[PDB]
Amino acid sequence: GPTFQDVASQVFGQPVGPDNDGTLYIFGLTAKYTEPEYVDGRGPYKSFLKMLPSIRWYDPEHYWTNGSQTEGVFKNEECVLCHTVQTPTIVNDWKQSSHGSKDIRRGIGIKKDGKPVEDLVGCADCHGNNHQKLEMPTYKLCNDCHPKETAEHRAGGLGSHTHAYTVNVLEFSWHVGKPAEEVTGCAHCHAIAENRCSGCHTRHKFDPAEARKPTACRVCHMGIDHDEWAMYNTSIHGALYEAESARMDWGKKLKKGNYRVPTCAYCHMQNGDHNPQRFGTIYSDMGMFQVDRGAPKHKAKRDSWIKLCQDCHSPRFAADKLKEMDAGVNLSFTKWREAAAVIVGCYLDGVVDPMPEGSAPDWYGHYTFSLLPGGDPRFYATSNLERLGLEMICYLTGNVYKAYAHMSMYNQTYGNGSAFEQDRKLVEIKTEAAKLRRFAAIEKKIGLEHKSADFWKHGEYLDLLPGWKRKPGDVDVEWFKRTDIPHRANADAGVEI
Amino acid sequence: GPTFQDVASQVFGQPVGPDNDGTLYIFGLTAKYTEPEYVDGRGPYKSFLKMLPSIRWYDPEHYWTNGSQTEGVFKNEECVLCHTVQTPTIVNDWKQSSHGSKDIRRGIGIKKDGKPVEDLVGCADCHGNNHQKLEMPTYKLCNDCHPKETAEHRAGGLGSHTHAYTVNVLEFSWHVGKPAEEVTGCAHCHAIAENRCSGCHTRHKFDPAEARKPTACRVCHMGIDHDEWAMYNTSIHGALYEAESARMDWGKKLKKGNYRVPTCAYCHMQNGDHNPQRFGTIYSDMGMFQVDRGAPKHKAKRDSWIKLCQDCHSPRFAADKLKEMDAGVNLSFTKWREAAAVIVGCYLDGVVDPMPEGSAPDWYGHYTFSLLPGGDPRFYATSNLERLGLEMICYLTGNVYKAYAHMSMYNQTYGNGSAFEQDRKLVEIKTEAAKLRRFAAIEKKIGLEHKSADFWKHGEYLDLLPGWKRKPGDVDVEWFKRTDIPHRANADAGVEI
Amino acid sequence: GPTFQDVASQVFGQPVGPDNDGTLYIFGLTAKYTEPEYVDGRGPYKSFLKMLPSIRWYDPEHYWTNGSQTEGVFKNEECVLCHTVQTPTIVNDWKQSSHGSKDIRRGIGIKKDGKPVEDLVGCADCHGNNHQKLEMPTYKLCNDCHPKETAEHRAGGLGSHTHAYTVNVLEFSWHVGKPAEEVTGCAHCHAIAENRCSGCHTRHKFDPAEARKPTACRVCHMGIDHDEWAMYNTSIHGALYEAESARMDWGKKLKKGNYRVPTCAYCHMQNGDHNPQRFGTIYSDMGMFQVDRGAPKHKAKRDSWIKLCQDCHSPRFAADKLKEMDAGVNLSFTKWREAAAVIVGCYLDGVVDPMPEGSAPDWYGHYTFSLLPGGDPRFYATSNLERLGLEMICYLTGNVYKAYAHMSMYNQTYGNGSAFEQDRKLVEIKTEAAKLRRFAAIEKKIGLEHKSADFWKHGEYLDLLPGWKRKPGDVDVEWFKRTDIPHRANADAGVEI
Ligand code: HEC
Ligand code: HEC
Ligand code: HEC
Ligand code: HEC
Ligand code: HEC
Ligand code: HEC
Ligand code: HEC
Ligand code: HEC
Ligand code: HEC
Ligand code: HEC
Ligand code: HEC
Ligand code: HEC
């Protein structure tokens, strides 16, 4: 019996075929999905988690292998001579780095194995001398000569660069719940933050001045679920950054009195601290958890922030601005709690369409409401009501905090992730709930037995989801028993975390 | 009987508590809203309008009080010596300002009380000498020495910087209709524009070159309801600004022949005019009111714009571009009028869900349709149909004008605030109306008496709204009787404006 | 019988009048639409296609006429002397161009009619000497002296600058289907790309260094249907561009080793090639057509891209990144095919509201489902289901490709045009389909004969659409018979293309 592709083929006169064969498929209609080559993912869901093979660059300790065609054992200078031709910009970068140029060194006292590093740190020093045994480093290499910065980079808790990949990719519902090729960018964004030292000061220049700029953060620290770049950019600080970036001195260390305009790094890597999370009052799951940072119990952290602001402001002004945040955040949660009551009420009254049993199982293998304890809050493969709910708490409520934290007058109120966007989302949620309730009331009165449509449960994409193949004993709970890393409180973790 | 918080508490094992106590509330579910400390707002709705106390910085004439812990009467140089340590960037800014550095003065002839100002204008000159009686200035201070710029800053009409706060915060429906902490950024954005001289050339450098850049405007002149920054930025002018900003001479006055690339200030503060509103053809409520700026009655203003463009263009080309605006704007209103007919038709047929009596009262205390005379057009605490209507007229239709005015080919057509966004919004409006009509038709036929859900009327946020507490005699109509400021035509103004 | 305007007039106390008379119409409610002055459009739909007269600047060969008031025959230097006063920036630009300044010439060997061009190329050389017979050039002028660049500019296929206007304005459904003043920016954006040489290096400086910057492309290469600027900008390449733009050497030709940071022009105008389309693997209708660019048949193009990336990367790394694109793209089409099945299923079951006969005819004059062969896929004047479908394939699916092509980790996954936006759009589509099916099921059971509302078919804007006036013989099929340009496969082309 014909598939969608089969029928499309009969209509468009293009044969059905595999997506991967190079055919230009008209609106992709007659193409069949082919699973890409995978490698096994790590972590507690290693029984089914996959990665694309290009994970080799980002978790090289577990995936890196020789894939070079060039043979030989070479000295540093030979690496440079050939790569001047073969990858010129890498050499140009390296020649403009302190590693490759003594002229710009600052005599900071770098040591390896207790001995001063006075030579060039060349290609072979970081990648190995044998071209068939090249190394793809992590912070572990950098630790050899930069232990202070590495220790700090490794000092964060859950929600920091430190466990971005190990915990918050490998344990994370939205990542583990999707086909690997859909979420490659998630693995890499989070893995760059954790495993590398090049997220802010990029290879191969490794220039701290570059790392001080907002461009060192905004590729990752952006978007609908954590819009801090946009919040910063739409503050007067951000406008002044844009106004002054071209002519200001970026060569100054991030210290009181060295900058007129504060950047991400100025406020979050104060005095060059490589554990930027630590200045935060408390981890709040991106502002989805409500906390009044101006409460007496958080006075030390609030006072610290006020003192940071006092580099360039009255501390009274700074205190007032952070109180505005506290107040704005508290007001924002009234709208979320309204939304949550409406949404859960629909579920409890059994009027959500689809109900959980009418959707594909969640990534746990459960037919459980996403906005209930044990559920999987999400924006995909779920009801419209649940999607809107997730958007309310994650995209909007969380970002109200970010808007206030970063002094974006517009995004606190009108703009993306604002009070007024919350208002509109709340209307949408109530609209969905109202529709659901009216349909159910009508169907009950006329004795129409409504069944949710099959497209909520099955489809070309839905059928790929891991929920379908979850089975008892498929969780590596020993991973969750580990105490050397934090963990996410997943429903099927099976142990104490 | 249990509240949402109570039930959540029983499920999540986290006690109910006040939002402000510092507890990290899981999804904010068990937190209770606590009203922040307020001060009374000013204006015609002073009987219930509130502000957060941090309004002290932005309407200091009515709210500023001593809040310093430092005592003493100091000379200018003493301010500097201590603040070099205590707020270094303020001192650094000031030292780089003409106020604090004679070397960059231009001999413009500044006078105070008819006498030339030849000395430094120091911290104490602007803030006072007594640290327990420090002053937080407005344009009134600046007027002492810069009467021309101040007079112009104070010469605008409604819709200008001049009355941004006094009228368009204190009289404005969306501001007065919401809890104060929700709209702090509104008060401050508008108050910075009105009461300060630092919106464009920031303190403490007060650098006109900074004020010439689009960064001097875009923090405020952005977003879904007035997207002129995005419109400018997505024009060739805006692209050239980005291309040339780093190397161009920003030290030149905004005059014909001094710039290749026009900025906001170039076109709207022509020849340094500090009443930027005046170059506009006519105030149109952000493009929500339809006016053909190319009509004979507006020839003087159109000719003036053409002559401005002629700094760098054929006047025929400029005339053609502004005619494109006129035509594009006129076409855009056909879609709004379509939407309005659909929406009002739903109300007149009584098929909106909720109907106004099913929602919380509007900020006037009325159960009145928002898109009818006397109603309160809005995006919050209203029906989905009404929300979509407001979005159509304000977010989209108004911004089509901005897209054309600023030569954004993309945003005129495809992009944010465009013709095609209007198209999609119109489909959405018709979709909502269609759903409403189908439900009503079904319910009528089967004799189901539909009542709008209680969540349209009551909820944790909805219950905070001022509409609930409005009562006869709660408007200060004497404020509206004032002829020394313009006014908004509010439904409960009670007098002639 | 009263129109909307008539009724509004009785309520607001503002007379009905033509939109163009200069009246400030309250919410545009009582204004009547007046058709702007048009000129006839060119192309196969010339029988009804219109343009605003300002098309004169963009298709000057067919529309340019004298419109100057200045008389005289002048020498180059006289043009300059007067225009120094009359249009100073044009002269300033020209004086800073190689055309107007021998000092910055590079001796490249420019010839006209086989003879070296050693003089200044002045205003009169490009525009003519007679001020009543001034010329408005296209690439045809530039060809006189820059044949190589012009030939390349003219070497592209469909989907390139080369036919942007001639084919993809004049034959394009969304353009020909709308009133001319609505889509002026479409005509001009596409005409600037095709007919001019100033899209990237603007007049009158014609500076290649400017053309190398992303600002040379992003005014056009942006937005919801082709967001490559945003994709680039949210890649590490884009962040580094922003970090380095102010201080980097933009005077270097776009060659291996000359740049650390790649721009649009670096990758798509490799070695100064003025046919940027040619580096693309295959034209895929902006990613709406599915093709695996990593398939064996595309090896040459894939290898070429890998070698380009190898300017600054391992070719293995580059190969891996482009494989990530292939995989991400293939996954993205599963969601589109899901959506398409749901949407077409609704049509085949006759439950779309409106059905095509309930909407205004499409621009062909047909009452045909937009997402069926022969239909007109669109976001306007169609059902909500069809609008959402178009958004899914065009705005989202197409941009997933762009997100991967440009290394935007965030926009591949979370952001604009991402996997997760596809997820949410798919929920929306299923939500619309579910609603449609539930209404139809209820109406069938209770014997309610539902007719789609008249507002789907008629309205102030809908009534302006060309579909209403289409008639047999109104297509210039001789245009489509042309073999010297490619064509769009329009339903009423009437001949082989
Ligand atoms: C240590 C200080 C390094 C030196 C010296 C050089 N490289 Fe490097 N390189 C380094 C790291 C830590 C990484 C991993 C990625 C990251 O950002 O952390 C890399 C990566 C590469 C790659 C692959 C990535 C790519 O862009 O293709 C190549 C091909 C590479 N490095 C080559 C290279 C050459 C030729 C060098 C000498 C001129 C060189 N590297 C210096 C760390 C270090
Ligand atoms: C100082 C003026 C800041 C600048 C510049 C930027 N941010 Fe910030 N950030 C700042 C504050 C006062 C806060 C609230 C912290 C508190 O505990 O009160 C934040 C918050 C964040 C967060 C969340 C941190 C947390 O929840 O603990 C992030 C991830 C963040 N900021 C990132 C960030 C980026 C990327 C910035 C540049 C674009 C940036 N911040 C600017 C202070 C300041
Ligand atoms: C962004 C979050 C960063 C990450 C991740 C890493 N570094 Fe960094 N680094 C960053 C900034 C903003 C600065 C300048 C800080 C300042 O005070 O101005 C730096 C600086 C360094 C330095 C120079 C130290 C010195 O004594 O001058 C080194 C040696 C350094 N960084 C190393 C380093 C290592 C080893 C990292 C991984 C563990 C690493 N950095 C990550 C920003 C960021
Ligand atoms: C960079 C381009 C990112 C991509 C892609 C993904 N996310 Fe992310 N993540 C990013 C940042 C900067 C932040 C921190 C914001 C803050 O205020 O802390 C986040 C955080 C989330 C977290 C925490 C969510 C929580 O418990 O509240 C997790 C678990 C997470 N990110 C994982 C993750 C994965 C795997 C993604 C794809 C499925 C997703 N992120 C996209 C930026 C990066
Ligand atoms: C007049 C020309 C001024 C001089 C000289 C100095 N300041 Fe000022 N300051 C001025 C104004 C008009 C304002 C109000 C805010 C605005 O933008 O209009 C301020 C503000 C302050 C503040 C509070 C705001 C903050 O950022 O914390 C402080 C603490 C302050 N000013 C201090 C200060 C010092 C120490 C000065 C001498 C070095 C100084 N100001 C000069 C106007 C003027
Ligand atoms: C000249 C090339 C301009 C530049 C640069 C910017 N704007 Fe503009 N603006 C311009 C015109 C011709 C118009 C239409 C005015 C008319 O009467 O025809 C506008 C409109 C505005 C408005 C609305 C003004 C009104 O309705 O009276 C605002 C608020 C505005 N522009 C702001 C603005 C900003 C913030 C800009 C930089 C980002 C900017 N404009 C650029 C001309 C030009
Ligand atoms: C943005 C809307 C501004 C506001 C609000 C204020 N100023 Fe301004 N100022 C602005 C610009 C763009 C410029 C340069 C204009 C030009 O022609 O290039 C200026 C300049 C000044 C100057 C210098 C005047 C001179 O003779 O050189 C002064 C003294 C000045 N501005 C003062 C001033 C005052 C007192 C303000 C509040 C009343 C004020 N400015 C507001 C932009 C803007
Ligand atoms: C700066 C960050 C703003 C915030 C926050 C708010 N608005 Fe605003 N306002 C802003 C600008 C630049 C404009 C002018 C746009 C133009 O084309 O004129 C506006 C204008 C509105 C107006 C006029 C609306 C009308 O009658 O048509 C008012 C009444 C208004 N703004 C008030 C207001 C308040 C109080 C806000 C929160 C409730 C809101 N604005 C956000 C920019 C600033
Ligand atoms: C050829 C190399 C040129 C020279 C020398 C000058 N101009 Fe030009 N101009 C040229 C072209 C190809 C165009 C069409 C637009 C495009 O971008 O392709 C133009 C346009 C104009 C216009 C109208 C457009 C406008 O911005 O108003 C004018 C008024 C104009 N040009 C005037 C002008 C003057 C005075 C010149 C000498 C100083 C001059 N141009 C030089 C190409 C060329
Ligand atoms: C190199 C690092 C690039 C930069 C910088 C930019 N783009 Fe790109 N683009 C690049 C690749 C590898 C691809 C995929 C091509 C393939 O066949 O695999 C693309 C794609 C595009 C397209 C579509 C081309 C097509 O489908 O044939 C466009 C229109 C495009 N890119 C434009 C563009 C712009 C405007 C950029 C700057 C903002 C830009 N690209 C950057 C490589 C690179
Ligand atoms: C963007 C897509 C462009 C369009 C359209 C046109 N040009 Fe261009 N041009 C562009 C770039 C990025 C560059 C620099 C390329 C490099 O290798 O760095 C150029 C350069 C030129 C030159 C200089 C050639 C030389 O020998 O140095 C010329 C003479 C030139 N361009 C002419 C030209 C003409 C005639 C065009 C229309 C047919 C044209 N360009 C369009 C970018 C773009
Ligand atoms: C510049 C400001 C644009 C506007 C306005 C319009 N479009 Fe466009 N068009 C633009 C670009 C950069 C691209 C290329 C993207 C790529 O990846 O190739 C497009 C492409 C479309 C195409 C092809 C659609 C197809 O068959 O798949 C056409 C037909 C098209 N553009 C036409 C067109 C018209 C006439 C518009 C208004 C109705 C529309 N575009 C807006 C950028 C420009």
CSV table of N, CA and C in Angstrom, one decimal, chain A residues 233 239-240 242-243 247 256 259-260 283 288-290 292 295 298 310-312 316-317 320-321 324 330 335-338 373 404 410 414 423-424 430-431 438 445, chain B residues 11 22 25 27-28 54 56-58 65 67 85-86 89 93 178 181-182 188 202-203 210 213 218 224-225 241 245-246 248 384 391 443 446 455 460-462:
chain,number,residue,atom,x,y,z
A,233,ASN,N,22.5,43.7,24.2
A,233,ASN,CA,22.6,44.5,23.0
A,233,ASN,C,21.6,45.7,23.0
A,239,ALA,N,24.4,49.3,23.4
A,239,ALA,CA,24.5,50.4,22.4
A,239,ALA,C,25.9,51.1,22.5
A,240,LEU,N,26.4,51.3,23.7
A,240,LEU,CA,27.7,51.9,23.9
A,240,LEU,C,28.8,51.0,23.4
A,242,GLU,N,28.6,48.9,20.9
A,242,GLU,CA,28.6,49.1,19.5
A,242,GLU,C,29.2,50.4,19.1
A,243,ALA,N,28.9,51.5,19.8
A,243,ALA,CA,29.4,52.8,19.5
A,243,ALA,C,30.9,52.9,19.7
A,247,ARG,N,37.1,51.8,18.4
A,247,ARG,CA,38.1,52.7,18.9
A,247,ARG,C,38.6,52.5,20.3
A,256,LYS,N,38.2,47.0,37.2
A,256,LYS,CA,37.7,48.3,37.6
A,256,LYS,C,38.6,49.4,37.1
A,259,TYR,N,37.7,49.9,31.7
A,259,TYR,CA,36.6,50.0,30.7
A,259,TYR,C,35.5,51.0,31.0
A,260,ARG,N,35.1,51.7,30.0
A,260,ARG,CA,33.9,52.5,30.2
A,260,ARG,C,32.6,51.7,30.0
A,283,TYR,N,21.7,29.2,40.8
A,283,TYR,CA,21.3,28.6,39.6
A,283,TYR,C,19.8,28.4,39.6
A,288,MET,N,13.7,29.9,34.9
A,288,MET,CA,12.4,29.1,35.0
A,288,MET,C,12.0,28.8,36.4
A,289,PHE,N,13.0,28.8,37.3
A,289,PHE,CA,12.7,28.7,38.7
A,289,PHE,C,12.8,30.1,39.3
A,290,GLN,N,11.8,30.4,40.2
A,290,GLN,CA,11.6,31.7,40.7
A,290,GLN,C,12.5,31.9,42.0
A,292,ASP,N,14.0,35.3,44.5
A,292,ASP,CA,14.2,36.7,44.7
A,292,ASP,C,15.6,36.9,45.1
A,295,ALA,N,16.5,39.0,48.3
A,295,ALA,CA,16.1,38.5,49.6
A,295,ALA,C,17.3,38.5,50.5
A,298,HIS,N,20.3,36.2,50.2
A,298,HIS,CA,21.2,36.3,49.0
A,298,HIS,C,22.0,37.7,49.1
A,310,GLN,N,29.2,49.3,40.8
A,310,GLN,CA,29.8,50.6,41.4
A,310,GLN,C,31.1,50.9,40.7
A,311,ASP,N,31.7,50.1,40.0
A,311,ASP,CA,32.9,50.4,39.1
A,311,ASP,C,32.5,51.7,38.3
A,312,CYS,N,31.3,51.8,37.9
A,312,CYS,CA,30.8,52.9,37.0
A,312,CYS,C,29.5,53.6,37.4
A,316,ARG,N,23.7,52.9,45.0
A,316,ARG,CA,22.3,53.1,45.3
A,316,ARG,C,21.5,52.9,44.0
A,317,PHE,N,22.1,53.4,42.9
A,317,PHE,CA,21.5,53.2,41.6
A,317,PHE,C,21.5,51.8,41.2
A,320,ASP,N,19.1,49.8,43.2
A,320,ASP,CA,17.7,50.1,42.6
A,320,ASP,C,17.4,49.2,41.4
A,321,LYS,N,18.4,49.2,40.5
A,321,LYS,CA,18.2,48.4,39.2
A,321,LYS,C,18.1,46.9,39.5
A,324,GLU,N,14.6,46.3,40.8
A,324,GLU,CA,13.7,46.3,39.6
A,324,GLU,C,13.6,45.0,39.0
A,330,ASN,N,9.3,38.7,39.9
A,330,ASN,CA,8.2,38.2,40.7
A,330,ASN,C,6.8,38.5,40.1
A,335,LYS,N,1.9,35.5,35.8
A,335,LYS,CA,1.4,35.1,34.5
A,335,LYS,C,1.7,33.6,34.2
A,336,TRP,N,2.9,33.1,34.6
A,336,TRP,CA,3.2,31.7,34.4
A,336,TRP,C,2.3,30.8,35.3
A,337,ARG,N,2.1,31.2,36.5
A,337,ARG,CA,1.2,30.4,37.4
A,337,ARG,C,-0.2,30.4,36.9
A,338,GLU,N,-0.7,31.5,36.3
A,338,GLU,CA,-2.0,31.6,35.6
A,338,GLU,C,-2.0,30.5,34.5
A,373,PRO,N,4.3,16.4,37.1
A,373,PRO,CA,5.5,15.7,37.6
A,373,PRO,C,5.8,14.4,36.9
A,404,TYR,N,15.8,41.9,32.6
A,404,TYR,CA,16.0,42.8,33.7
A,404,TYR,C,17.5,42.8,34.2
A,410,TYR,N,13.4,47.8,26.8
A,410,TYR,CA,12.5,47.4,25.8
A,410,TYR,C,12.1,45.9,26.0
A,414,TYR,N,8.1,45.4,26.2
A,414,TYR,CA,7.5,45.1,24.9
A,414,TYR,C,8.1,44.0,24.1
A,423,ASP,N,2.0,38.3,28.2
A,423,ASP,CA,0.6,38.6,28.1
A,423,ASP,C,0.0,37.9,26.9
A,424,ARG,N,0.6,38.0,25.8
A,424,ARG,CA,0.1,37.5,24.5
A,424,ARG,C,0.1,36.0,24.5
A,430,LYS,N,-4.9,30.5,27.0
A,430,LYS,CA,-6.3,30.5,27.3
A,430,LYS,C,-7.2,30.3,26.1
A,431,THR,N,-6.8,30.8,24.9
A,431,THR,CA,-7.5,30.5,23.7
A,431,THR,C,-7.5,29.0,23.3
A,438,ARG,N,-14.6,24.0,24.7
A,438,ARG,CA,-15.8,24.1,23.9
A,438,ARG,C,-16.0,22.9,23.0
A,445,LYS,N,-22.2,16.7,24.7
A,445,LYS,CA,-23.7,17.0,24.6
A,445,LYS,C,-24.3,16.2,23.4
B,11,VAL,N,2.4,18.3,45.8
B,11,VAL,CA,2.9,17.5,44.7
B,11,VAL,C,4.4,17.6,44.6
B,22,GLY,N,13.5,34.5,49.2
B,22,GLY,CA,14.8,34.0,48.7
B,22,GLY,C,14.8,32.5,48.4
B,25,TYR,N,12.1,28.7,44.2
B,25,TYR,CA,10.8,28.0,43.9
B,25,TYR,C,10.8,27.2,42.6
B,27,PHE,N,9.9,25.9,39.4
B,27,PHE,CA,9.0,26.5,38.4
B,27,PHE,C,8.1,27.6,38.9
B,28,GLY,N,8.5,28.3,40.0
B,28,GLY,CA,7.8,29.3,40.7
B,28,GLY,C,6.4,28.9,41.2
B,54,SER,N,12.6,53.4,42.6
B,54,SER,CA,13.7,53.8,41.7
B,54,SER,C,13.3,54.8,40.7
B,56,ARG,N,13.0,57.6,41.5
B,56,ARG,CA,13.8,58.7,42.0
B,56,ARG,C,14.9,59.2,41.0
B,57,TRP,N,15.4,58.3,40.1
B,57,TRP,CA,16.5,58.7,39.2
B,57,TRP,C,15.9,59.4,38.0
B,58,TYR,N,14.7,59.2,37.6
B,58,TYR,CA,14.1,59.5,36.3
B,58,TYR,C,13.0,60.6,36.4
B,65,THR,N,15.5,61.9,46.8
B,65,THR,CA,15.8,62.3,48.2
B,65,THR,C,17.2,61.8,48.4
B,67,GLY,N,20.0,59.7,49.8
B,67,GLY,CA,20.2,58.3,50.2
B,67,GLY,C,21.6,57.9,50.3
B,85,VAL,N,38.5,56.5,43.2
B,85,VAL,CA,38.5,55.2,43.8
B,85,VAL,C,37.1,54.6,43.8
B,86,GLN,N,36.1,55.4,44.1
B,86,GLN,CA,34.7,54.9,44.4
B,86,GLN,C,33.8,54.6,43.2
B,89,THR,N,34.9,55.0,36.6
B,89,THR,CA,34.5,55.3,35.2
B,89,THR,C,33.7,56.6,35.1
B,93,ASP,N,35.0,59.2,32.5
B,93,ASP,CA,34.1,59.9,31.6
B,93,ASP,C,34.2,61.4,31.7
B,178,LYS,N,-1.4,48.5,34.3
B,178,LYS,CA,-0.6,47.4,34.7
B,178,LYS,C,0.1,47.7,36.1
B,181,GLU,N,5.6,47.4,38.7
B,181,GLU,CA,6.9,46.7,38.4
B,181,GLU,C,6.9,46.0,37.1
B,182,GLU,N,5.8,45.8,36.5
B,182,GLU,CA,5.7,45.2,35.1
B,182,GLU,C,6.2,46.2,34.0
B,188,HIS,N,10.9,54.5,32.5
B,188,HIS,CA,12.3,54.9,32.4
B,188,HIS,C,12.7,55.3,31.0
B,202,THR,N,25.5,60.1,26.1
B,202,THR,CA,25.4,59.6,27.5
B,202,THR,C,26.3,60.4,28.5
B,203,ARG,N,25.9,60.4,29.7
B,203,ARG,CA,26.8,60.8,30.8
B,203,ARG,C,27.9,59.7,30.9
B,210,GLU,N,29.1,60.6,19.8
B,210,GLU,CA,28.4,59.4,20.2
B,210,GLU,C,26.9,59.6,19.8
B,213,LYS,N,25.6,58.7,16.3
B,213,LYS,CA,25.5,57.3,15.9
B,213,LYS,C,24.1,56.7,16.1
B,218,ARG,N,18.7,53.7,19.1
B,218,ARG,CA,18.1,52.3,18.9
B,218,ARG,C,17.7,51.6,20.1
B,224,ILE,N,8.8,45.7,18.1
B,224,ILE,CA,7.6,45.2,17.4
B,224,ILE,C,6.6,46.3,17.1
B,225,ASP,N,6.6,47.3,17.9
B,225,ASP,CA,5.6,48.4,17.7
B,225,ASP,C,6.2,49.7,17.1
B,241,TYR,N,26.3,52.2,7.2
B,241,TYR,CA,26.6,52.6,8.5
B,241,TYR,C,27.5,51.5,9.2
B,245,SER,N,31.2,52.6,10.0
B,245,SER,CA,31.3,53.2,11.3
B,245,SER,C,32.7,53.2,11.9
B,246,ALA,N,33.4,52.2,11.7
B,246,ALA,CA,34.7,52.0,12.4
B,246,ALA,C,35.8,53.0,11.9
B,248,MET,N,34.9,56.0,9.8
B,248,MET,CA,34.4,57.3,9.4
B,248,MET,C,34.6,58.3,10.5
B,384,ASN,N,-8.5,36.6,22.1
B,384,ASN,CA,-7.5,36.4,21.1
B,384,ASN,C,-7.8,37.2,19.9
B,391,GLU,N,-2.4,43.7,17.3
B,391,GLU,CA,-1.1,43.4,16.7
B,391,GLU,C,-1.1,43.9,15.2
B,443,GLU,N,-23.2,25.6,18.8
B,443,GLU,CA,-23.8,25.7,20.1
B,443,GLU,C,-25.2,26.2,20.0
B,446,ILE,N,-27.5,23.1,18.7
B,446,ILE,CA,-27.7,22.1,19.6
B,446,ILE,C,-28.2,22.5,21.0
B,455,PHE,N,-11.2,31.7,33.5
B,455,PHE,CA,-9.8,32.1,33.4
B,455,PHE,C,-9.6,33.4,32.5
B,460,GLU,N,-4.2,34.8,38.8
B,460,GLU,CA,-3.3,35.5,39.7
B,460,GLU,C,-2.8,36.8,39.2
B,461,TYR,N,-2.6,37.0,37.9
B,461,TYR,CA,-2.2,38.2,37.3
B,461,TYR,C,-3.5,39.1,37.1
B,462,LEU,N,-4.5,38.6,36.4
B,462,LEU,CA,-5.7,39.3,36.1
B,462,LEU,C,-6.3,40.1,37.3
